[PDB]
mmCIF file of C-alpha atoms and ligand atoms in Angstrom:
data_model
loop_
_atom_site.group_PDB
_atom_site.id
_atom_site.type_symbol
_atom_site.label_atom_id
_atom_site.label_comp_id
_atom_site.label_asym_id
_atom_site.label_seq_id
_atom_site.Cartn_x
_atom_site.Cartn_y
_atom_site.Cartn_z
ATOM 1 C CA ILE X 1 60.161 121.201 110.432
ATOM 2 C CA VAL X 2 57.872 118.044 111.030
ATOM 3 C CA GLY X 3 57.336 116.502 113.743
ATOM 4 C CA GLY X 4 59.988 118.673 115.256
ATOM 5 C CA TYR X 5 60.047 120.696 118.068
ATOM 6 C CA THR X 6 59.974 125.005 118.697
ATOM 7 C CA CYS X 7 63.941 126.157 118.672
ATOM 8 C CA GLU X 8 65.188 127.914 121.904
ATOM 9 C CA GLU X 9 65.551 131.303 120.653
ATOM 10 C CA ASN X 10 68.255 132.436 118.921
ATOM 11 C CA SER X 11 70.208 129.073 120.591
ATOM 12 C CA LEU X 12 71.336 127.970 116.887
ATOM 13 C CA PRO X 13 72.290 132.027 116.215
ATOM 14 C CA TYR X 14 73.965 130.383 112.758
ATOM 15 C CA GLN X 15 70.931 129.958 111.359
ATOM 16 C CA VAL X 16 69.653 132.479 108.437
ATOM 17 C CA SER X 17 66.684 132.628 106.920
ATOM 18 C CA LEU X 18 66.508 133.409 102.883
ATOM 19 C CA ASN X 19 63.401 135.934 102.023
ATOM 20 C CA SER X 20 62.492 137.480 98.678
ATOM 21 C CA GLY X 21 58.980 138.419 99.399
ATOM 22 C CA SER X 22 58.612 135.557 101.952
ATOM 23 C CA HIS X 23 60.808 133.655 103.643
ATOM 24 C CA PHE X 24 61.646 130.953 100.844
ATOM 25 C CA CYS X 25 64.590 128.797 102.078
ATOM 26 C CA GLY X 26 66.925 128.433 105.118
ATOM 27 C CA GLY X 27 70.834 129.319 105.027
ATOM 28 C CA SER X 28 73.759 128.641 107.507
ATOM 29 C CA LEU X 29 75.556 131.146 108.034
ATOM 30 C CA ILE X 30 79.816 130.144 107.388
ATOM 31 C CA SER X 31 81.603 133.312 107.928
ATOM 32 C CA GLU X 32 81.358 136.665 108.416
ATOM 33 C CA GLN X 33 80.569 137.624 105.115
ATOM 34 C CA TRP X 34 78.347 134.138 103.813
ATOM 35 C CA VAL X 35 76.515 132.148 103.943
ATOM 36 C CA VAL X 36 75.418 127.701 102.834
ATOM 37 C CA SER X 37 72.537 127.758 101.117
ATOM 38 C CA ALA X 38 71.543 124.549 98.920
ATOM 39 C CA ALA X 39 71.397 125.427 94.834
ATOM 40 C CA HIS X 40 67.309 125.556 94.441
ATOM 41 C CA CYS X 41 67.072 128.005 96.409
ATOM 42 C CA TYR X 42 69.607 130.382 93.703
ATOM 43 C CA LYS X 43 67.167 133.499 93.534
ATOM 44 C CA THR X 44 68.683 136.998 91.477
ATOM 45 C CA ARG X 45 68.526 139.068 94.539
ATOM 46 C CA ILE X 46 67.666 137.498 98.318
ATOM 47 C CA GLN X 47 67.842 138.947 101.618
ATOM 48 C CA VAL X 48 69.340 137.361 104.183
ATOM 49 C CA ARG X 49 67.338 137.771 107.848
ATOM 50 C CA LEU X 50 69.696 136.738 110.631
ATOM 51 C CA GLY X 51 69.383 136.517 114.529
ATOM 52 C CA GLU X 52 65.600 135.429 113.951
ATOM 53 C CA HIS X 53 63.378 133.704 116.162
ATOM 54 C CA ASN X 54 60.303 134.422 115.523
ATOM 55 C CA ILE X 55 60.345 135.390 111.307
ATOM 56 C CA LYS X 56 56.762 138.072 111.357
ATOM 57 C CA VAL X 57 57.706 139.524 114.745
ATOM 58 C CA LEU X 58 60.646 142.054 115.397
ATOM 59 C CA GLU X 59 62.018 140.984 118.098
ATOM 60 C CA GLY X 60 64.983 143.514 118.345
ATOM 61 C CA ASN X 61 67.751 140.609 117.068
ATOM 62 C CA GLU X 62 67.742 140.926 114.220
ATOM 63 C CA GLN X 63 70.050 141.786 111.053
ATOM 64 C CA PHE X 64 68.650 142.003 107.116
ATOM 65 C CA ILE X 65 71.690 142.016 104.897
ATOM 66 C CA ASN X 66 71.114 141.731 100.772
ATOM 67 C CA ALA X 67 73.173 139.610 99.284
ATOM 68 C CA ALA X 68 75.802 140.793 97.147
ATOM 69 C CA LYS X 69 76.434 137.519 95.299
ATOM 70 C CA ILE X 70 75.208 134.105 94.755
ATOM 71 C CA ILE X 71 77.642 131.705 93.512
ATOM 72 C CA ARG X 72 75.675 128.614 92.250
ATOM 73 C CA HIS X 73 78.173 125.219 92.817
ATOM 74 C CA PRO X 74 79.135 124.793 88.640
ATOM 75 C CA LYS X 75 78.657 120.880 88.657
ATOM 76 C CA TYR X 76 74.587 121.536 89.565
ATOM 77 C CA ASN X 77 72.627 119.702 88.022
ATOM 78 C CA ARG X 78 68.780 120.341 88.382
ATOM 79 C CA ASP X 79 67.602 116.897 87.162
ATOM 80 C CA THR X 80 69.223 114.486 89.249
ATOM 81 C CA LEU X 81 69.981 116.803 91.858
ATOM 82 C CA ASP X 82 73.493 116.641 91.918
ATOM 83 C CA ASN X 83 76.243 119.030 93.737
ATOM 84 C CA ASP X 84 72.651 120.666 95.395
ATOM 85 C CA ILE X 85 75.194 123.907 97.140
ATOM 86 C CA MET X 86 75.323 127.314 97.202
ATOM 87 C CA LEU X 87 77.575 130.582 98.770
ATOM 88 C CA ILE X 88 75.187 133.237 99.056
ATOM 89 C CA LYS X 89 77.842 137.366 99.888
ATOM 90 C CA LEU X 90 76.439 139.138 101.769
ATOM 91 C CA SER X 91 76.325 143.015 101.173
ATOM 92 C CA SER X 92 78.078 143.904 104.661
ATOM 93 C CA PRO X 93 78.660 141.091 107.208
ATOM 94 C CA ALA X 94 77.485 140.497 109.681
ATOM 95 C CA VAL X 95 78.427 141.643 113.125
ATOM 96 C CA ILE X 96 78.565 138.682 114.678
ATOM 97 C CA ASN X 97 77.681 137.977 119.089
ATOM 98 C CA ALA X 98 75.525 136.295 121.385
ATOM 99 C CA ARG X 99 72.804 135.028 118.580
ATOM 100 C CA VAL X 100 74.179 135.721 115.167
ATOM 101 C CA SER X 101 77.573 133.945 114.836
ATOM 102 C CA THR X 102 78.752 131.052 112.514
ATOM 103 C CA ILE X 103 79.115 127.352 112.376
ATOM 104 C CA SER X 104 82.110 125.179 112.161
ATOM 105 C CA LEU X 105 83.254 123.505 108.159
ATOM 106 C CA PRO X 106 83.730 119.415 109.010
ATOM 107 C CA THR X 107 86.817 117.841 109.339
ATOM 108 C CA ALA X 108 85.617 114.467 108.856
ATOM 109 C CA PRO X 109 81.825 113.786 107.228
ATOM 110 C CA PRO X 110 78.981 111.843 110.389
ATOM 111 C CA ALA X 111 79.017 108.289 110.170
ATOM 112 C CA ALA X 112 76.038 106.547 110.853
ATOM 113 C CA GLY X 113 74.294 106.804 113.880
ATOM 114 C CA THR X 114 75.825 110.130 114.952
ATOM 115 C CA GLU X 115 72.216 112.474 115.471
ATOM 116 C CA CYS X 116 72.285 115.429 114.810
ATOM 117 C CA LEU X 117 70.228 118.947 114.790
ATOM 118 C CA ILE X 118 67.848 120.119 111.654
ATOM 119 C CA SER X 119 66.025 123.447 111.900
ATOM 120 C CA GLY X 120 63.829 125.584 109.691
ATOM 121 C CA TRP X 121 61.073 127.782 109.326
ATOM 122 C CA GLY X 122 59.764 124.889 106.596
ATOM 123 C CA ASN X 123 56.339 123.316 106.731
ATOM 124 C CA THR X 124 54.901 121.610 109.470
ATOM 125 C CA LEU X 125 52.899 118.853 108.379
ATOM 126 C CA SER X 126 52.888 116.159 105.888
ATOM 127 C CA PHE X 127 50.249 116.736 104.308
ATOM 128 C CA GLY X 128 48.971 120.601 104.992
ATOM 129 C CA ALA X 129 50.222 124.075 105.011
ATOM 130 C CA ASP X 130 51.360 125.195 108.098
ATOM 131 C CA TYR X 131 54.399 126.715 108.114
ATOM 132 C CA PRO X 132 55.414 127.925 111.394
ATOM 133 C CA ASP X 133 56.597 131.580 112.807
ATOM 134 C CA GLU X 134 58.819 130.074 114.996
ATOM 135 C CA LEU X 135 62.178 128.221 113.988
ATOM 136 C CA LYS X 136 61.980 124.205 114.434
ATOM 137 C CA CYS X 137 64.371 122.116 115.842
ATOM 138 C CA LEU X 138 64.728 118.286 115.189
ATOM 139 C CA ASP X 139 67.260 115.710 116.787
ATOM 140 C CA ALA X 140 67.456 113.036 113.942
ATOM 141 C CA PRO X 141 70.108 110.050 113.361
ATOM 142 C CA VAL X 142 71.939 109.962 110.197
ATOM 143 C CA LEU X 143 71.431 106.958 108.011
ATOM 144 C CA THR X 144 73.624 104.656 106.703
ATOM 145 C CA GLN X 145 74.930 104.747 102.717
ATOM 146 C CA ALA X 146 73.428 101.800 101.989
ATOM 147 C CA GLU X 147 70.076 102.338 103.755
ATOM 148 C CA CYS X 148 69.623 105.957 102.084
ATOM 149 C CA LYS X 149 70.224 104.259 98.942
ATOM 150 C CA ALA X 150 67.180 101.452 99.254
ATOM 151 C CA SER X 151 64.540 103.954 100.283
ATOM 152 C CA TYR X 152 65.838 106.200 97.245
ATOM 153 C CA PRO X 153 66.858 103.367 94.000
ATOM 154 C CA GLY X 154 69.457 104.667 91.846
ATOM 155 C CA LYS X 155 68.498 108.960 93.344
ATOM 156 C CA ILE X 156 70.612 109.254 95.482
ATOM 157 C CA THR X 157 74.792 110.692 94.070
ATOM 158 C CA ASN X 158 77.678 111.316 95.918
ATOM 159 C CA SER X 159 76.617 114.588 96.875
ATOM 160 C CA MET X 160 74.035 113.273 99.267
ATOM 161 C CA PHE X 161 73.598 111.245 102.062
ATOM 162 C CA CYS X 162 69.991 110.694 104.737
ATOM 163 C CA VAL X 163 68.964 111.530 108.033
ATOM 164 C CA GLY X 164 65.754 110.914 109.334
ATOM 165 C CA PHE X 165 63.213 108.204 109.869
ATOM 166 C CA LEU X 166 61.828 105.471 108.624
ATOM 167 C CA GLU X 167 58.797 105.230 110.321
ATOM 168 C CA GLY X 168 58.189 108.754 109.687
ATOM 169 C CA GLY X 169 57.033 111.981 111.034
ATOM 170 C CA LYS X 170 59.798 113.441 111.982
ATOM 171 C CA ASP X 171 61.351 115.675 108.720
ATOM 172 C CA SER X 172 62.285 118.279 106.979
ATOM 173 C CA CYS X 173 60.048 119.730 104.414
ATOM 174 C CA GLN X 174 59.237 122.409 101.993
ATOM 175 C CA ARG X 175 60.493 125.719 103.423
ATOM 176 C CA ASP X 176 63.553 124.318 105.270
ATOM 177 C CA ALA X 177 65.613 124.004 102.099
ATOM 178 C CA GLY X 178 69.105 124.777 101.864
ATOM 179 C CA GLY X 179 68.921 125.335 105.562
ATOM 180 C CA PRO X 180 71.708 122.895 108.104
ATOM 181 C CA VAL X 181 72.231 119.884 109.203
ATOM 182 C CA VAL X 182 74.449 119.845 112.273
ATOM 183 C CA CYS X 183 76.415 117.301 113.769
ATOM 184 C CA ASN X 184 79.129 117.282 116.341
ATOM 185 C CA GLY X 185 79.317 120.801 116.363
ATOM 186 C CA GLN X 186 79.955 121.182 112.439
ATOM 187 C CA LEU X 187 77.678 122.258 109.501
ATOM 188 C CA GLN X 188 77.467 118.272 107.817
ATOM 189 C CA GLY X 189 74.262 118.750 105.639
ATOM 190 C CA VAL X 190 72.148 120.842 102.716
ATOM 191 C CA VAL X 191 68.449 120.344 103.414
ATOM 192 C CA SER X 192 67.987 119.757 100.210
ATOM 193 C CA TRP X 193 65.240 117.220 99.324
ATOM 194 C CA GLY X 194 62.894 114.247 99.989
ATOM 195 C CA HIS X 195 60.238 112.503 98.989
ATOM 196 C CA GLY X 196 56.868 114.355 100.295
ATOM 197 C CA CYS X 197 57.609 115.406 103.904
ATOM 198 C CA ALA X 198 57.824 112.972 106.446
ATOM 199 C CA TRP X 199 57.033 110.073 104.857
ATOM 200 C CA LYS X 200 57.072 106.528 105.472
ATOM 201 C CA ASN X 201 60.641 104.753 104.284
ATOM 202 C CA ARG X 202 61.345 108.411 102.560
ATOM 203 C CA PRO X 203 63.801 110.099 104.510
ATOM 204 C CA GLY X 204 65.200 113.334 104.054
ATOM 205 C CA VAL X 205 67.999 114.425 101.742
ATOM 206 C CA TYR X 206 70.469 116.722 101.959
ATOM 207 C CA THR X 207 73.817 117.906 100.389
ATOM 208 C CA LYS X 208 77.033 116.386 101.722
ATOM 209 C CA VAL X 209 78.913 119.707 102.720
ATOM 210 C CA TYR X 210 82.053 117.883 103.716
ATOM 211 C CA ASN X 211 82.465 116.897 100.404
ATOM 212 C CA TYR X 212 82.614 120.944 99.598
ATOM 213 C CA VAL X 213 85.416 122.120 101.505
ATOM 214 C CA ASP X 214 88.007 123.039 99.316
ATOM 215 C CA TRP X 215 85.618 124.576 96.648
ATOM 216 C CA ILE X 216 83.718 126.738 99.860
ATOM 217 C CA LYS X 217 87.265 127.595 101.209
ATOM 218 C CA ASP X 218 88.466 128.634 97.105
ATOM 219 C CA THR X 219 85.293 130.589 96.278
ATOM 220 C CA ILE X 220 85.487 132.764 98.835
ATOM 221 C CA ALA X 221 88.699 133.428 98.931
ATOM 222 C CA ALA X 222 88.114 134.585 94.851
ATOM 223 C CA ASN X 223 85.611 136.787 96.270
ATOM 224 C CA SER X 224 86.900 138.895 98.229
ATOM 225 C CA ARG T 1 44.654 125.130 76.544
ATOM 226 C CA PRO T 2 46.234 122.342 75.762
ATOM 227 C CA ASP T 3 45.983 118.440 77.518
ATOM 228 C CA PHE T 4 48.930 119.774 81.119
ATOM 229 C CA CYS T 5 46.292 122.364 82.021
ATOM 230 C CA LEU T 6 44.858 119.460 83.600
ATOM 231 C CA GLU T 7 47.161 118.028 85.011
ATOM 232 C CA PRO T 8 47.351 118.143 89.261
ATOM 233 C CA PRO T 9 50.220 120.703 90.732
ATOM 234 C CA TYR T 10 53.257 118.761 91.416
ATOM 235 C CA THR T 11 55.060 120.443 94.881
ATOM 236 C CA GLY T 12 58.076 118.467 93.745
ATOM 237 C CA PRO T 13 60.855 116.785 95.143
ATOM 238 C CA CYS T 14 63.433 119.947 96.393
ATOM 239 C CA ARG T 15 62.074 121.507 100.107
ATOM 240 C CA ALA T 16 61.704 125.409 98.648
ATOM 241 C CA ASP T 17 58.664 127.114 98.675
ATOM 242 C CA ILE T 18 58.773 129.318 95.060
ATOM 243 C CA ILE T 19 55.338 130.821 94.498
ATOM 244 C CA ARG T 20 54.406 129.671 91.302
ATOM 245 C CA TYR T 21 50.593 129.078 89.705
ATOM 246 C CA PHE T 22 49.371 126.075 88.592
ATOM 247 C CA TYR T 23 45.450 126.188 86.319
ATOM 248 C CA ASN T 24 42.858 124.795 88.352
ATOM 249 C CA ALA T 25 40.455 123.570 86.242
ATOM 250 C CA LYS T 26 37.789 123.321 88.273
ATOM 251 C CA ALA T 27 37.894 126.724 89.929
ATOM 252 C CA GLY T 28 38.222 127.579 85.676
ATOM 253 C CA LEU T 29 41.328 130.157 86.975
ATOM 254 C CA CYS T 30 45.303 130.246 87.868
ATOM 255 C CA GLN T 31 45.929 130.094 91.842
ATOM 256 C CA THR T 32 49.100 130.137 93.895
ATOM 257 C CA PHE T 33 51.170 126.389 95.245
ATOM 258 C CA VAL T 34 54.586 126.262 96.686
ATOM 259 C CA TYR T 35 57.198 124.491 94.574
ATOM 260 C CA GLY T 36 59.462 122.773 95.780
ATOM 261 C CA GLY T 37 62.264 124.262 93.450
ATOM 262 C CA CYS T 38 62.690 121.329 91.373
ATOM 263 C CA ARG T 39 61.316 118.924 88.878
ATOM 264 C CA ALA T 40 58.615 121.083 87.984
ATOM 265 C CA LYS T 41 55.824 119.471 85.794
ATOM 266 C CA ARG T 42 53.946 121.784 82.421
ATOM 267 C CA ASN T 43 51.156 122.830 85.479
ATOM 268 C CA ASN T 44 53.732 125.524 86.510
ATOM 269 C CA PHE T 45 53.883 129.240 85.648
ATOM 270 C CA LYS T 46 55.916 132.073 87.770
ATOM 271 C CA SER T 47 53.083 134.337 86.981
ATOM 272 C CA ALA T 48 49.019 134.321 86.960
ATOM 273 C CA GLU T 49 49.614 136.126 83.392
ATOM 274 C CA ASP T 50 51.327 133.111 81.502
ATOM 275 C CA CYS T 51 49.703 130.651 83.270
ATOM 276 C CA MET T 52 46.761 133.048 81.512
ATOM 277 C CA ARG T 53 48.037 133.149 78.568
ATOM 278 C CA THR T 54 48.608 128.632 78.549
ATOM 279 C CA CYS T 55 45.551 127.759 80.334
ATOM 280 C CA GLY T 56 42.759 131.191 80.220
ATOM 281 C CA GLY T 57 40.131 129.511 80.297
ATOM 282 C CA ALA T 58 40.164 126.745 80.238
HETATM 283 CA CA1 CA E 1 62.369 138.813 114.422
#
């Protein structure tokens, strides 16, 4: 996250870190046993780290749970980036408590102008490699679909929407992918892609979680 | 020693941090970079051994 701030500790109890060696992507806890992330975050083995704030220091609230199943959306296209969403089933249920808990799936997608909270352990610079130890947060508005498309002509599919700022300086970035965009108490987006990070006229592009509510619920049911 | 070994590395638009290798023709060495997870260019290898096999060297 570029141009954000350090989140209050454990105030985003749904935020997870996906780890393979090191943190490589974020995710969101949606039930005791399931996490939503981005399909481009796929690896055949993932450790999910819940309850984190500082990912380099044991703080005593963490739960580390290996993924038992990792399921990319069947229509993910790695070249257009369409349908960039995935589900991870935890090998054991997370212990739900004040510091680890779920975020609701949405009942309607977010209107343009809605202010949302984007979070993750991604790069904090638009040029450079400053990967933070502590979880970062950004408040940012949903863009109209017209302005999203104008920013990335030809590239915005029906699975995608933009959140951020055309003036630059505030965005998600590498290592944020798969993490949450929360608006009005609902998981509305999955961090996906952008041209650069926080570049002028190049806002962040996110997967529209609302389009996948049925897929998520049916996939959870089919794999338990 | 193919031409694409001389391309600059390309993180790409996706926002993961996948560890990959590129041949750095200035250093004469395969080196790591952050690959965002999609739309790779050719100077992008999963290990240093794969990078050295293809690019050396030169
Ligand atoms: Ca920690």
